[PDB]
């Protein structure tokens, strides 16, 4: 009982400490910045190869090829410029909820409700692709997968845990456990030295791949959060939740910085992504469309309404030339 | 233009044809979801038919291909992955009929049935309900009255009407009686005739779907 009171006192002390250094009034700091006006985006291409709802999509460092996964037990690599399909990998367990594309371009990792992470070898002799390694050890369901190197992969599973693996041996190198609920998202920093994860506790934690110990804990959401994306500078990130609000946190200030909400938006968000310059914020709602938020003024810029169902994924090219949105409509479009 | 990209286009067309064939073959079949309480009757149902996270069971009966998804081996928030099963043909629910006195189990089973039936995604799919351990229920009623778990029950302690009362109590839990149907059956360890009941339910569901898609409904 006394120990719980001590923990509560520590929490109150932390809250007071972060409140003492909180003279932000940021809307009074950037109120003189000219608006970005109105942003008009028109669809440029449509990839029609899937026969079911798609749940994942990841661009490549080439910024030309991308991968997408759906529930028909197939993930196919697209050629965005020409709309041709490069590969069509038949996967064993049709229940897949995430996918990843290696930065070098040699590997593709997919995993879902089957509690196993599968890594496929793209560039190899004998022609077709092959399953390089199957990763086992989790007890929930894989929510997100990101690549650090060609030998290291970080996974986010449904059993309130995150892990770091090595492909050559298939063993859990490091395990992160500080959450009290299912973790749904994950995003690596540009320098690949640390990452943040968001769980069903309406709290986001900041880990680091070196020691495996949590650094800071962020909170302020009223419901489950589903999307996380780092700022291009690497000192901030934005989160989306079922609360129908998007908010931006700061690592150095260690507290909330913005809230993005509107009166006529009462539905949650499944995807959040930033622009190359960081001045625009892309959020994918379940209202069958995604909006563009001016990240420095919390003012809406444009609306991208071209889908007949909720969007389950969203990504921006590495050079920031185009944005691709996928939905349960089974068609994913490219906007520019 | 298109110096050697013609071969790439041909490869894309060929893999698209393969995708079309695979999609047609996958759409030819029907999928079944098996829910139920913890180790109530789900074990013996799978054994009656020919037959990690989840396990998929493949079997055929009278020129029809069935796929059964046993998702009970996953411990997590159900609301975060239950939308992946939208569009399933039917839901199989197993209830232990002889566990009416051991523990409260019947009340939590009814709560689970209420949660599953009135879900936001399953507002249209039909439900097939199985009441296992019928033989074991015969010997546990004459000694232990059914009033233990049903205080409002007032009737003779006979199996013939107690089973009907339990069936009605399970069946009247759906708030949408004009859109979805509930098929109730009594199953024991022997008398392997449940596959015919499943076939009849799936045939009715397919007929309704064909009528809906044909413009008549």
């Amino acid at each position, epitope marked *: 009982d006394q120990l719980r009171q001590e923990a509560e006192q520590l929490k109150n002390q932390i809250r007071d400490a972060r409140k003492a250094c909180a003279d932000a009034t940021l809307s009074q700091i950037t109120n003189n910045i000219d608006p970005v006006g109105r942003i008009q985006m028109r669809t440029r291409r449509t990839l029609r190869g899937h026969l079911a709802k798609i749940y994942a999509m990841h661009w490549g460092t080439d910024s030309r090829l991308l991968v997408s996964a759906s529930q028909d037990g197939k993930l196919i690599i697209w050629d965005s410029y020409t709309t041709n399909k490069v590969h069509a990998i038949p996967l064993r367990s049709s229940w897949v909820m995430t996918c990843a594309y290696a930065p070098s371009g040699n590997y593709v990792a997919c995993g879902g409700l089957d509690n196993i992470c599968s890594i496929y070898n793209l560039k190899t002799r004998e*022609g077709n692709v092959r399953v390089s390694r199957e990763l086992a050890g989790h007890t929930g369901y894989l929510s997100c997968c990101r690549f650090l190197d060609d030998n290291q992969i970080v996974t986010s599973s449904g059993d309130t845990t995150c892990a770091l693996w090595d492909i050559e041996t298939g063993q859990q190198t490091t395990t992160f456990t500080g959450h009290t609920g299912d973790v749904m998202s994950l995003s690596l920093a540009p320098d690949t030295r640390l990452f943040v994860s968001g769980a069903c506790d309406a709290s986001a934690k900041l880990w680091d791949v070196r020691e495996g110990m949590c650094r800071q804990t962020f909170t302020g959401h009223e419901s489950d959060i589903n999307a996380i994306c780092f700022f291009p500078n690497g000192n901030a990130f934005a989160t989306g939740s079922d609360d129908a609000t998007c908010r931006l946190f700061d690592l150095r200030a260690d507290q909330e910085l913005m809230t993005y909400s509107h009166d006529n938006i009462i539905c949650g968000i499944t995807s959040v992504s930033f622009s190359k310059s960081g001045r625009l914020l892309l959020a994918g709602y379940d209202d069958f469309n995604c909006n563009v938020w001016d990240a420095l003024k919390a003012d809406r810029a444009g609306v991208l309404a071209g889908h007949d169902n909720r969007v389950s994924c969203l990504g921006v090219t590495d050079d920031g030339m185009a944005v691709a949105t996928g939905s349960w409509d089974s068609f994913l479009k490219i906007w520019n | 233009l298109s*110096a*050697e990209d*013609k*071969a790439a286009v041909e*490869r894309s067309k060929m893999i698209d044809r393969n995708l079309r064939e695979d999609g047609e073959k996958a759409a030819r079949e029907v999928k079944l979801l098996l829910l139920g309480a913890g180790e109530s009757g789900k074990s013996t149902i799978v054994k009656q038919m020919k037959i990690t996270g989840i396990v998929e069971t493949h079997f055929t009966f009278k020129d029809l291909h069935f796929k059964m998804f046993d998702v009970g081996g996953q411990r997590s928030e159900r609301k975060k992955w239950i939308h992946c099963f939208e569009g399933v043909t039917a839901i199989i629910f197993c209830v232990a009929l002889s566990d009416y006195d051991l523990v409260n189990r019947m009340h939590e089973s009814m709560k689970l049935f209420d949660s599953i039936c009135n879900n936001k995604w399953f507002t249209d799919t039909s439900i097939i309900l199985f009441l296992n351990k019928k033989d074991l229920f015969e010997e546990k009623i004459k000694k232990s009255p059914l009033t233990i778990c049903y205080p409002e029950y007032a009737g003779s302690n006979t199996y013939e009407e107690a089973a009907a009362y339990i069936q009605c109590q399970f069946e009247d839990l759906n708030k949408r009686k004009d859109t979805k149907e509930i098929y109730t059956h009594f199953t024991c360890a022997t008398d392997t005739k449940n596959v015919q009941f499943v076939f009849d339910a799936v045939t009715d569901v397919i007929i309704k779907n064909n009528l809906k898609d044909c413009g008549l409904f």
Partner: single-chain antibody, 232 residues
Framework: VQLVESGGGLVQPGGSRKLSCSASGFAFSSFGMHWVRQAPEKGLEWVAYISSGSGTIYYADTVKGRFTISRDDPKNTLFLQMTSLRSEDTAMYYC??????????????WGQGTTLTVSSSDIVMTQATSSVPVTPGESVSISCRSSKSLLHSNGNTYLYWFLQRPGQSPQLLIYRMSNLASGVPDRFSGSGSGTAFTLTISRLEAEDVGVYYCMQHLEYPLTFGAGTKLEL
């Protein structure tokens, strides 16, 4: 991977013969196939090509109407039917593997080859030289010229470099004039512009002597080069 050619021998003029290419160790049904023949003391020439799934077939001008090509995907075998043999068909025939997609490396493997003897608008590619004396440890340069600009509107220049060691089948070195094939040491390099190309070898050691061929792939038919020979 493993390719074996069989069906050689001596054929009287005006007869017929069948050549069988046996493919093993790789997915045959996903690869396109080519037939390339080499004269007894001359360079390589292109004969025929089959797309994936037998959906597209091309023939050379000098063999059109006399040669028939086909594949058997279930049995993993490639066939070439030869009719009305002349005295100019005496050569050695190679089975070539190829695959086309964004980022692929076609012409990456060549078969052993079979010997056959008979008793008695195109783009031309020119080699600057024909033979150069080479000392080990130095650097040499090989030039290649084309009658047409190989640069395309999509930003790709189609140029392939091949090296043939004595008594061995040629192997791919560089594709699209700038990329190094798998297993090739980083000593080799490629550069150049439209209608002007150059191959660079640095600190070359032994076992690098042979004939280097210059090949284009902008349009059919595919034309090889005369061949530059390197001698110690």
């Amino acid at each position: 991977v493993q390719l074996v050619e069989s069906g050689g021998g001596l054929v009287q003029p005006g007869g017929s013969r069948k050549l069988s290419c046996s493919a093993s160790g790789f997915a045959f049904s996903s690869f396109g196939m080519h037939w390339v023949r080499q004269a007894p003391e001359k360079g390589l020439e292109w004969v025929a090509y089959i797309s994936s799934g037998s959906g597209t077939i091309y023939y050379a001008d000098t063999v059109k109407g006399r040669f028939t090509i086909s594949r058997d995907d279930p049995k993993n075998t490639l066939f070439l039917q030869m009719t009305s043999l002349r005295s100019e068909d005496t050569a050695m025939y190679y089975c070539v593997r190829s695959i086309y997609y964004y980022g692929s490396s076609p012409f990456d493997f060549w078969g052993q080859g079979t010997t056959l003897t008979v008793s008695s608008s195109d783009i031309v590619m020119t080699q600057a030289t024909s033979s150069v004396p080479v000392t080990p440890g130095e650097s040499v340069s090989i030039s290649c010229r084309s009658s047409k600009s190989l640069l395309h509107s999509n930003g790709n220049t189609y140029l392939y470099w091949f090296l043939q060691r004595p008594g061995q089948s040629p192997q791919l070195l560089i594709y699209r004039m700038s990329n190094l094939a798998s297993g090739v040491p980083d000593r080799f390099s490629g550069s150049g512009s439209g209608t002007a190309f150059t191959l660079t070898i640095s600190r070359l050691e032994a076992e690098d002597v042979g004939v280097y061929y210059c090949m284009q792939h902008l349009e059919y038919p595919l034309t090889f080069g005369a061949g530059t020979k390197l001698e110690l």
